[PDB]
Amino acid sequence: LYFQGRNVALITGITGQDGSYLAEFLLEKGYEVHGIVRRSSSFNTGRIEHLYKNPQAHIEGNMKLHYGDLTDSTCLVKIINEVKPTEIYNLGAQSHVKISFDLAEYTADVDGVGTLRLLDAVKTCGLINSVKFYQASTSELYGKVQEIPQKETTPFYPRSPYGAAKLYAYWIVVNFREAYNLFAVNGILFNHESPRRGANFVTRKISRSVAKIYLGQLECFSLGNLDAKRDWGHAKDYVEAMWLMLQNDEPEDFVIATGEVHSVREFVEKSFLHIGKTIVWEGKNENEVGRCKETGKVHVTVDLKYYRPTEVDFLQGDCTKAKQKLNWKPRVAFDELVREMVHADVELMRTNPNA
Amino acid sequence: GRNVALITGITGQDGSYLAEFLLEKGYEVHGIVRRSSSFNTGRIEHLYKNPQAHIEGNMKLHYGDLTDSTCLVKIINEVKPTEIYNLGAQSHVKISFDLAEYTADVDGVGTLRLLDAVKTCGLINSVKFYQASTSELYGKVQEIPQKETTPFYPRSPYGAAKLYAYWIVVNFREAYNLFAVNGILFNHESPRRGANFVTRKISRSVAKIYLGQLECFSLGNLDAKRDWGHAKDYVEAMWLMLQNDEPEDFVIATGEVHSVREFVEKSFLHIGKTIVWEGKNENEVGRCKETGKVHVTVDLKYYRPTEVDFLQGDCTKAKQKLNWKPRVAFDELVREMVHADVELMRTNPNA
Amino acid sequence: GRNVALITGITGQDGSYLAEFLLEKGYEVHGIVRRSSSFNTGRIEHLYKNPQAHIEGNMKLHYGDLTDSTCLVKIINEVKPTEIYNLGAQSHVKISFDLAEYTADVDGVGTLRLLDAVKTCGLINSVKFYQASTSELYGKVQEIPQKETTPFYPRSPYGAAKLYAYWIVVNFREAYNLFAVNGILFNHESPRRGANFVTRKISRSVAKIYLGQLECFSLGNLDAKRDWGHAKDYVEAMWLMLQNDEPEDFVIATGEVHSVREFVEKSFLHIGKTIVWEGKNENEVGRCKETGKVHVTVDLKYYRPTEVDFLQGDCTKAKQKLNWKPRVAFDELVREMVHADVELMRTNPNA
Amino acid sequence: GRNVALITGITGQDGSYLAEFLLEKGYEVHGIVRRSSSFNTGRIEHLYKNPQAHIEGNMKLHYGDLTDSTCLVKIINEVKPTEIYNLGAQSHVKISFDLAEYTADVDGVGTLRLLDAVKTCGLINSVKFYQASTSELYGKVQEIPQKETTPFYPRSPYGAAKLYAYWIVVNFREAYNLFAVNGILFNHESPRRGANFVTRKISRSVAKIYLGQLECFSLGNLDAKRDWGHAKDYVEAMWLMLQNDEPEDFVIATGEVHSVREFVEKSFLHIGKTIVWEGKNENEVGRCKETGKVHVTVDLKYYRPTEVDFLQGDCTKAKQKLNWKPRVAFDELVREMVHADVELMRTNPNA
Ligand SMILES: NC(=O)c1ccc[n+]([C@@H]2O[C@H](COP(=O)([O-])OP(=O)(O)OC[C@H]3O[C@@H](n4cnc5c(N)ncnc54)[C@H](OP(=O)(O)O)[C@@H]3O)[C@@H](O)[C@H]2O)c1
Ligand SMILES: NC(=O)c1ccc[n+]([C@@H]2O[C@H](COP(=O)([O-])OP(=O)(O)OC[C@H]3O[C@@H](n4cnc5c(N)ncnc54)[C@H](OP(=O)(O)O)[C@@H]3O)[C@@H](O)[C@H]2O)c1
Ligand SMILES: NC(=O)c1ccc[n+]([C@@H]2O[C@H](COP(=O)([O-])OP(=O)(O)OC[C@H]3O[C@@H](n4cnc5c(N)ncnc54)[C@H](OP(=O)(O)O)[C@@H]3O)[C@@H](O)[C@H]2O)c1
Ligand SMILES: NC(=O)c1ccc[n+]([C@@H]2O[C@H](COP(=O)([O-])OP(=O)(O)OC[C@H]3O[C@@H](n4cnc5c(N)ncnc54)[C@H](OP(=O)(O)O)[C@@H]3O)[C@@H](O)[C@H]2O)c1
Ligand SMILES: Nc1nc2c(ncn2[C@@H]2O[C@H](COP(=O)(O)OP(=O)(O)O[C@H]3O[C@@H](C(F)(F)F)[C@@H](O)[C@@H](O)[C@@H]3O)[C@@H](O)[C@H]2O)c(=O)[nH]1
Ligand SMILES: Nc1nc2c(ncn2[C@@H]2O[C@H](COP(=O)(O)OP(=O)(O)O[C@H]3O[C@@H](C(F)(F)F)[C@@H](O)[C@@H](O)[C@@H]3O)[C@@H](O)[C@H]2O)c(=O)[nH]1
Ligand SMILES: Nc1nc2c(ncn2[C@@H]2O[C@H](COP(=O)(O)OP(=O)(O)O[C@H]3O[C@@H](C(F)(F)F)[C@@H](O)[C@@H](O)[C@@H]3O)[C@@H](O)[C@H]2O)c(=O)[nH]1
Ligand SMILES: Nc1nc2c(ncn2[C@@H]2O[C@H](COP(=O)(O)OP(=O)(O)O[C@H]3O[C@@H](C(F)(F)F)[C@@H](O)[C@@H](O)[C@@H]3O)[C@@H](O)[C@H]2O)c(=O)[nH]1
Ligand SMILES: Nc1nc2c(ncn2[C@@H]2O[C@H](COP(=O)(O)OP(=O)(O)O)[C@@H](O)[C@H]2O)c(=O)[nH]1
Ligand SMILES: Nc1nc2c(ncn2[C@@H]2O[C@H](COP(=O)(O)OP(=O)(O)O)[C@@H](O)[C@H]2O)c(=O)[nH]1
Ligand SMILES: Nc1nc2c(ncn2[C@@H]2O[C@H](COP(=O)(O)OP(=O)(O)O)[C@@H](O)[C@H]2O)c(=O)[nH]1
Ligand SMILES: Nc1nc2c(ncn2[C@@H]2O[C@H](COP(=O)(O)OP(=O)(O)O)[C@@H](O)[C@H]2O)c(=O)[nH]1
């Protein structure tokens, strides 16, 4: 049964980057934390296995995991009915934009309709007035940005099947809030990174590749659009904002961002500086290369296979509303983020060159 | 010289008028029809070459479903259309609250399945694609009237699914140079409109009352306001949007607003009865002034959890670029629908 | 005790007869109806309390779909049935080859969704569940005649989907002690049979030929042999299966076999014509002895890629345990269908 | 000629051994990999041309999912494989009871999606298709031993989904003349086996106990009896089936039966411990004879609602027609698995 003082979180996507930090953040506050984990042929729990009570035996304590999938309605109802959460964080998703162009229907089913399935499970279980629901929305919703900077009232313009699926999810969450008075909020989070970031997102790809070059495991790597500009924060700061949004007296949507913009090119330059290399760019378009000023070796090339058919050229978030209402502020700035990711990947690649 | 149209949703209101419109222009018209335990082709069976033997001529029908990717690829490969009109949908807003996932799968993901089939079949640079978008996208309207630059604010699972479809069509246009357009059509009605949409519900019920086959019927929100046009005028806009030199999205509307209550009042005037209202909210009833008899009541079961209170479309862009303009105005629409349902109900009291 | 039935597929042939059968026994009958752009309730509209107003009495209808889990849970939680008859299906074998995935989703996974909805609602010990299984499971028959223990060998995507449904029903029975049964029904027909199944296609076409509305029609495999009963007899067997003390699977059939050719011959005799066959394979035609006119041809588009040549059911187990026996035999079934279709086609040549 | 394999499920146990096998035979090997938030390629990363940079040579990987029809068509159309091995599946029986619908969509309908992609792509005449069928199809075994003609009786949602897949493969073979075969493989294990299948759970746990990193572990049904072979031997059989001149289904098994209890006993013997059993049912424990410590308990949460008590395969047909025989017998299998897991746990106590 529900009672005041019992805090029970259900996290979809607990094995991902954000889920892993959010689980840690909520455990520290004394929550019982439940997560939904996909069945996989090998365990996919590497980011959260340190949160077992006994990590050698994989015995659970205050973090409890359940097999499920956002495409299986019955499994979501069974889990929610057993857990009776006070807070639900829907972080599960096919979260990669480039992959969404080749997996557009799967991305729609998980990222769009899966949000509806989870909301519908809350309603089926009779929990509409018992649970607070956080939806992981995204600055990708702004796509071809209609305003600079982007805030909660900037109109959406998605540019991928991922963005379209997340737009459905955004509005179905609003509809449950308005139709049924579910406390449900959209966190419109701008890009956020960490050493736990998926390896094929651009920041982690750069930090991994720079680490491999530093260690002699790699000579060169390829990127797509060097001129893309992004607002990059640290995932550990942003999961705190997710929790603050469910602590708010009223269910409101918020932009969470740093408000500071950098290019992919700058992320590359700063990463290489951390291994003592100055990158000099030469050429243009798909023939642009990044050369080490000291040695003259080409370390970065461009490959059109990494371009997106409809690029998101520029993102910059204005989080004034969150600063005023939630008293949220980012604590990690861009330069520290880059150093932390390169440093962590150098250590990772030293231990395991196949990592 | 080749004009081959493929219409999903050909059995519905709009598909039936669009089929007639394209046949009149000499198109070969193909339609996708759902398997049904009884035939669902009543609106188009007059377009068979031999309607007694159900033998096809220039309108050809194919079993399929917007939730079955393989069947869509198979049909598009066989037909090789030059124009595709995606009119198929679970199109009812109230039903979408109880069938939210089905509505997402057909109206949202089904649009992606059809676009993906176009791409799979190698047609991305030859076919022109029309998406049936909707004024329901404006939902809780952010401007009056609503135009192409008015932000969307959907208010039902139908609206949210159609918003996904709107943007996935834009993405296929922008990513792959598909000639694909969104028709943002405001409400449009006809004697072929589904019986549980408000206008046809009213005209059917008023017809039955005129013929003494019914005494009373119940509605939901009487003060909802809508921009109502005639479906036969609007399918022409769909075709015009694919004739345009460049693929653009357009609002199609009359720009004139009336309430459900006004549709009731005008419908009853056509059968010689003046409705006067008494009471409030779910206790409001509509009584014939001349006889004192109650003919209209309100039932909360017909309300929607999140209502769309007001729609009024501004189709300036379509007027200027497509030269489209509506022909049937509200008063004629009501008269036409009441007259047609009187003729139908005369033939069959159970209709 | 409470007698509340939930019928999926209530608008179909069997659902319409089962609803009548259960209403006569005093049940409250609930059905799940697909949203459709025209109403699909023609077989059951006479069961409204007021058929002119479409007001429900003891038969109550709910919009839903076997591919929407949430909707199924909502309906089962509202209705709390004591008996569930899962008759809803894409039931056409030929169309299943073009709609294989949709047929799997509705006929196979939909049965699982309904069973899971029962379990989700906490009714696993409180409901009896009937699954509409089919002689198509025997496909390439491994025994003649076929009984409950005959090994299955399906021959179409419909057969495969129904076989999944058969085994998931058995698994719910064995794993969770659900009172769930498979009715393995052989072909059953009626004047309400879908028009594109072979028996109704023949009876409709013979009627149209009698009335001068049609000259000729085409069939597929004339040599297919079937065990054909009357749907009205067979819905009684479904009910008897849920009255049984223990959940058991049963074959329901006549045990008598006739060819499609024979059904054609007997149907034409009821309009006073003796059909005489000439030619072979795709060139075979049936000609009226009295007039010399060709009335039947063969068209390969009606062949199935993997035919089911022969079905003959052995219903000894049901005769012994349920005291079930069919009341309508083949000759009376034919007469009834031809007679009903002449009446229908006289009233409407486009029917 | 051209030898290009497409392996779904390449990241799994069998896919990793099959990829190795086909690369050694000179094939270009393509694999479909699911998007995952961390890479799921641990079993095959040594097959990159440069494993430090994850650069591909003769093994090429493609993102996809068996539930996404468009992605399968794109991959198959790009690869143009000569052989397709459908190993991708939710392959865990206990998990299938909680994930019944997902298991149906991937293991059942996903097989149809892959077959339909072959057909869509025009490859029906140029590809050989292997389906990963399973002795779980026999479930409550209807013959002992089980062979190709033994009737199936599945006992889980996994079994039911794989039964759908088996018959849809047969139907593509018979309807469209696709060279498509069902490998009916009995249980096969290796040091790459998923950690929550019973053999690998035992070997992992015995290794952790040996190294003092675990005290005890729990099992479900100790008395279940299985036919266990080595995955490395069995992937050769898959390839042999597609080398056959005619498409036939084959049982692949050892024909030797052992219990879970015996697997436990033999595993502990390899670390120098004699397990002795005391108690009954869920209170049964396995105790070290030497030290008196309890190392094995029983937990009903690992029981399946409908167990498969006994499997024993008869692979006479494969021995005659394929000249296949297993190289690894049960005793060596146990030894290899415990030794491998000891070596793993020495490197990483959290493994
Ligand atoms: N990081 C950003 O910059 C950012 C910005 C805004 C919004 N977002 C959104 O925020 C959320 C978390 O981001 P992230 O960076 O943590 O993404 P991530 O690392 O890619 O984690 C995705 C999670 O979702 C799970 N998942 C995927 N498909 C699923 C399914 N069908 N059913 C259930 N679970 C499934 C994954 O499981 P596996 O481990 O099994 O793959 C993983 O746990 C996502 O919804 C993402 O779209 C991210
Ligand atoms: N009328 C309006 O005021 C209005 C306004 C803007 C946009 N729209 C959109 O315009 C389009 C047509 O409107 P309408 O009034 O003609 O709607 P309609 O009469 O309800 O017709 C709906 C059509 O879609 C078909 N359909 C439904 N589910 C399907 C599925 N799963 N697969 C394939 N076909 C399916 C229906 O087939 P059955 O006959 O088998 O049910 C019917 O042919 C719809 O997309 C509607 O949402 C309508
Ligand atoms: N008649 C036989 O000889 C025979 C023999 C053995 C087994 N069966 C099985 O017995 C059952 C009834 O047979 P029938 O002859 O009555 O079939 P039918 O006339 O084709 O009726 C099929 C019913 O299922 C409904 N339905 C179809 N797809 C649906 C979906 N996605 N969600 C919900 N409902 C859906 C149809 O609704 P619409 O009206 O909207 O299409 C109709 O009510 C079927 O399962 C059939 O496969 C028939
Ligand atoms: N081993 C046996 O004893 C045995 C006996 C007979 C038959 N089988 C069948 O043989 C095949 C392989 O067995 P295994 O032991 O190698 O199983 P496994 O280790 O569990 O591998 C399962 C594979 O399928 C992939 N997969 C899961 N869901 C998928 C999806 N939705 N789309 C695409 N790929 C997906 C998995 O990817 P992730 O790595 O991303 O999870 C993995 O590559 C399976 O079909 C299994 O059912 C096994
Ligand atoms: N541990 C690990 N790391 C990998 C793997 N593949 C790539 N990377 C690292 O990922 C980062 C970005 O590389 P990318 O090419 O931008 O990533 P993609 O995900 O787009 O493509 C990768 O897909 C793989 C998949 F199997 F998923 F299809 C393979 O095809 C691989 O060759 C390809 O690079 C870099 O740091 C890589 O080292 C892998 O299997 N295991
Ligand atoms: N021919 C016909 N007309 C019908 C039928 N049901 C309603 N109407 C007419 O439709 C108009 C609107 O009535 P509504 O109540 O607003 O329509 P809904 O679709 O919301 O609800 C209807 O659903 C039916 C369904 F079976 F689909 F669930 C039944 O439950 C029916 O009782 C209910 O009215 C009016 O003019 C009606 O005459 C029917 O079966 N056959
Ligand atoms: N009332 C009505 N009857 C029809 C219709 N089409 C066929 N029949 C009658 O059905 C019987 C069987 O004919 P079939 O050709 O064996 O039926 P199919 O379902 O295989 O094919 C039919 O499909 C239709 C569909 F639209 F669904 F795709 C059209 O293509 C139609 O031309 C074709 O006959 C006969 O008695 C017919 O008179 C129709 O639209 N309305
Ligand atoms: N490396 C690793 N090994 C694990 C993990 N969990 C279990 N094991 C090992 O698996 C073997 C079998 O254990 P089981 O309990 O029979 O396995 P299940 O898959 O049924 O259940 C497991 O599910 C997990 C999941 F997150 F997936 F839900 C967690 O709940 C975990 O506590 C539970 O054991 C043993 O050798 C374990 O060491 C893990 O996260 N990482
Ligand atoms: N993932 C990825 N992104 C790249 C690459 N090269 C440039 N980018 C750009 O980097 C930006 C951020 O991409 P990503 O990290 O995947 O996050 P996104 O904002 O969700 O698309 C996008 O504009 C990409 O187009 C590359 O090799 N991989
Ligand atoms: N369908 C329907 N709508 C009603 C009824 N009573 C009032 N309305 C209102 O009429 C308006 C138009 O409804 P509808 O014809 O279904 O078309 P919509 O604009 O797409 O929702 C909506 O605001 C409804 O809430 C009723 O009985 N049925
Ligand atoms: N539906 C249909 N079946 C035909 C036709 N001609 C021959 N048949 C055969 O009649 C038999 C019964 O078919 P049908 O009535 O559809 O029921 P089924 O037994 O479920 O396939 C099958 O063997 C068909 O192949 C035809 O024109 N239509
Ligand atoms: N996975 C698993 N199986 C167990 C356990 N204890 C007993 N078994 C039995 O071991 C047998 C083989 O199980 P498994 O390795 O998962 O493969 P399966 O034959 O496909 O079910 C089954 O009869 C299980 O019930 C356990 O803890 N885990």
Domain identity same for D63 and D167? yes
| 3-state secondary structure string across D196-209 | CCHHHHHHHHHHHH
Token match 């720079």: residue? A210
Q: How far apart are CA C239 and CA C298, in angstroms?
A: 39
- For residue B315 the two structure tokens come to 């189709």
Buried b (16+ CB within 10 A) or exposed e, A225-254: bbebbbbbbbbbbbbbbbbbbbeeeebebb
Q: Best interface-test mutation with B: which of C38, C66, C96, C192 has the largest number of B CBs within 10 A?
A: C38
Buried b (16+ CB within 10 A) or exposed e, D210-237: beebbeebebbbbebbbbbbbbbbbbbb
A168 lines ligand 9 (CB under 6 A): no
CATH number at residue B293: 3.90.25.10
Write the DSSP assignment of B173-222 as a string of letters. Answer: HHHH--EEEEEEEPPEE-TTS-TTSHHHHHHHHHHHHHTTS-S-EEES-T
Q: Phi and psi at residue A183, in whole multiples of 5°?
A: -75, 95
Give the Å distances, CA to CA, from C338 to C206, C230, D216.
7, 14, 75
Among the listed residues B85, B130, B138, B158, the single catalytic one is B158
Question: What share of residues in chain C are helix, strand, coil (percent, to 5)?
Answer: 40, 20, 40
Q: How far apart are CA D193 and CA D196, in angstroms?
A: 8
Closest partner residue to B52 (CB to CB) among C39, C195, C350 is C350
CA angle C146, C147, C151 (to 5 degrees): 75
Domain identity same for A149 and A59? yes
Buried b (16+ CB within 10 A) or exposed e, D11-42: bbbbbbbbbbbbbeeebbbbbbbbbbbbebbe
Is residue C83 among the annotated active site residues? no
Closest partner residue to D35 (CB to CB) among A17, A42, A96 is A96
**Helix or strand holding residue A123 (H, E):** helix A114-124
Chain CA centroid to CA C344, Å: 21
Query: How far away, in angstroms, is C99 Cα from ligand 2 center?
Result: 20
Give the gap in angstroms from C-alpha B163 to the nearest C-alpha of chain A.
7
Give the gap in angstroms from C-alpha C118 to the nearest C-alpha of chain A.
11
Q: Best interface-test mutation with C: which of B18, B35, B37, B302 has the largest number of C CBs within 10 A?
A: B37
Chains that touch B (3 or more CB pairs under 8 A): A, C, D
Contacts of C293 (CB under 8 A, 6+ apart): C215, C287
Domain identity same for B182 and B303? no
D260 lines ligand 12 (CB under 6 A): yes
DSSP 8-state class, residue A59: B
Q: List the residue whose alpha carbon is closest to atom 24 of ligand 2.
A: B88
Q: Is D49 helix (H, G, I), strand (E, B) or coil?
A: coil
Question: What share of residues in chain B are helix, strand, coil (percent, to 5)?
Answer: 40, 20, 40
CATH number at residue A84: 3.40.50.720
Q: How far apart are CA D16 and CA D231, in angstroms?
A: 10
Q: Which residues of chain A neighbour C69 with C-beta distances below 8 Å?
A: 73-74
Residues with CB under 6 A from ligand 3: B 36-38; C 8-9, 11-15, 32, 34, 36, 40, 65-67, 87-91, 106, 132, 134, 185, 187-188, 194
| Peptide bond between residue A149 and the one before it cis (omega within 30 degrees of 0) | yes
Residue C162 CA: nearest ligand 3 atom is 47
Q: Phi and psi at residue C85, in whole multiples of 5°?
A: -115, 110
Q: What is the resolution of this structure in A?
A: 1.6
Instruction: List residues in chain A touching B: CB distance below 8 A.
Output: 73, 101, 104-105, 108-109, 112-113, 116-117, 120, 155, 158-161, 163-165, 167-168, 171-172, 175, 178-180, 309-310
- Compute how many other C-beta atoms are within 10 angstroms of the C-beta atom of residue C212: 9
DSSP 8-state class, residue D213: S
A171 lines ligand 8 (CB under 6 A): no
Q: Which residues of chain B neighbour D116 with C-beta distances below 8 Å?
A: 70
Q: Is A50 helix (H, G, I), strand (E, B) or coil?
A: helix
Contacts of A84 (CB under 8 A, 6+ apart): A1, A2, A8, A127, A130
How many A-B residue pairs are in contact by the CB < 8 A criterion?
84
Domain identity same for A287 and A154? no
Among the listed residues C41, C82, C111, C134, the single catalytic one is C134
Chain CA centroid to CA D75, Å: 24
Query: Max alpha carbon distance in chain D (Å)?
Result: 65
Q: Is C43 helix (H, G, I), strand (E, B) or coil?
A: coil
Sequence length of chain D is 351
Domain identity same for A181 and A269? no
What determination technique applies here? Answer: X-ray
Q: List the residue whose alpha carbon is closest to atom 10 of ligand 1.
A: A136
Is residue A67 among the annotated active site residues? no
Residue of B nearest to C350 (CA): B52
Judge whether C254 and C313 are in contact, CB under 8 Å. yes
Judge whether A150 and A139 are in contact, CB under 8 Å. yes
Q: How far apart are CA B220 and CA B201, in angstroms?
A: 11
Domain identity same for D1 and D83? yes
Q: Kindly tell me the burial class for residue C226, based on how many C-beta atoms sit within 10 Å of its own C-beta (0-12, 13-18, 19 or more).
A: buried
A19 lines ligand 1 (CB under 6 A): yes
**Helix or strand holding residue B273 (H, E):** none
A188 lines ligand 8 (CB under 6 A): no
Give the Å distances, CA to CA, from B329 to B253, B255, B308, B333, D276.
11, 10, 22, 6, 90
Closest partner residue to C214 (CB to CB) among B53, B74, B92 is B53
Q: How far apart are CA D45 and CA C131, in angstroms?
A: 47
Cross-chain residue pair D174–C155, CB shorter than 8 Å: yes
Q: How far apart are CA C218 and CA D41, in angstroms?
A: 56
Find, among C257, C290, C32, C240, the residue nearest to C144 by Cα. Answer: C257
Closest partner residue to C349 (CB to CB) among B9, B36, B52 is B52
Domain identity same for D198 and D212? yes
Residue type, B77: N
DSSP 8-state class, residue D302: G
Cross-chain residue pair D95–A67, CB shorter than 8 Å: yes
Contacts of A5 (CB under 8 A, 6+ apart): none
Q: List the residue whose alpha carbon is closest to atom 13 of ligand 5.
A: A200
Residue type, B287: R
Cross-chain residue pair B120–D120, CB shorter than 8 Å: yes
Among the listed residues D41, D134, D150, D199, the single catalytic one is D134
Q: Which residues of chain C neighbour B68 with C-beta distances below 8 Å?
A: 99-102
Write the DSSP assignment of A194-243 as a string of letters. Answer: -TTS-TTSHHHHHHHHHHHHHTTS-S-EEES-TT-EEE-EEHHHHHHHHH
Domain identity same for A325 and A298? no
* Number of alpha carbons in the 13 Å side-chain half-sphere of residue D325: 3
Q: Kindly tell me the burial class for residue A51, based on how many C-beta atoms sit within 10 Å of its own C-beta (0-12, 13-18, 19 or more).
A: buried
D110-120 vs D157-176: helix crossing angle, rounded to 10: 20
Q: Kindly tell me the burial class for residue A307, based on how many C-beta atoms sit within 10 Å of its own C-beta (0-12, 13-18, 19 or more).
A: middle
- Compute how many other C-beta atoms are within 10 angstroms of the C-beta atom of residue C1: 3
Which segments of D are annotated as binding site for NADP(+)? 9-14, 34-37, 65-66, 87-91, 102, 162, 188, 193
Q: Which residues of chain B neighbour A142 with C-beta distances below 8 Å?
A: none
- Compute how many other C-beta atoms are within 10 angstroms of the C-beta atom of residue C147: 17
Domain identity same for D154 and D223? no
Give the Å distances, CA to CA, from B249 to B134, B236, B244, B252, D54.
11, 15, 11, 10, 44
Residue C60 CA: nearest ligand 6 atom is 30
**Helix or strand holding residue A104 (H, E):** helix A104-107
- For residue D206 the two structure tokens come to 């015995």
Domain identity same for D139 and D271? no
Token match 């002119």: residue? C52
Domain identity same for B108 and B198? no
Q: How far apart are CA B336 and CA B330, in angstroms?
A: 10
Give the Å distances, CA to CA, from C228 to C88, C315, D252.
20, 13, 41
Give the Å distances, CA to CA, from B158 to B129, B136, C149, C156.
21, 8, 47, 35
Q: How far apart are CA D172 and CA C157, in angstroms?
A: 9
A202-214 vs A334-351: helix crossing angle, rounded to 10: 50
Cross-chain residue pair A67–D99, CB shorter than 8 Å: yes
Token match 């004739």: residue? B243
Is residue B336 among the annotated active site residues? no
Query: Max alpha carbon distance in chain A (Å)?
Result: 67
Domain identity same for A151 and A288? no
Q: How far apart are CA C336 and CA B284, in angstroms?
A: 51
D180 lines ligand 12 (CB under 6 A): no
Domain span at residue D43? 1-193+229-256+308-328
Write the DSSP assignment of B87-130 as a string of letters. Answer: --S---HHHHHHSHHHHIIIIIIHHHHHHHHHHHTT-TTT-EEE
Among the listed residues C28, C83, C136, C189, the single catalytic one is C136
Closest partner residue to A105 (CB to CB) among D39, D70, D194 is D70
Number of domains in chain A: 2
Token match 């002689």: residue? C135
Q: How far apart are CA B161 and CA B112, in angstroms?
A: 11
Token match 């595993």: residue? D267
Q: Is B59 helix (H, G, I), strand (E, B) or coil?
A: strand
Cross-chain residue pair C194–B101, CB shorter than 8 Å: no
Give the Å distances, CA to CA, from A59 to A33, B21, C17, D216, D217.
14, 68, 56, 12, 10
C330-347 vs C198-210: helix crossing angle, rounded to 10: 50
Ligand nearest to the Cα of A197, by number: 1
Residue of A nearest to C68 (CA): A73
Cross-chain residue pair D208–A39, CB shorter than 8 Å: no
Q: How far apart are CA B156 and CA B137, in angstroms?
A: 9
- For residue B265 the two structure tokens come to 């009042």
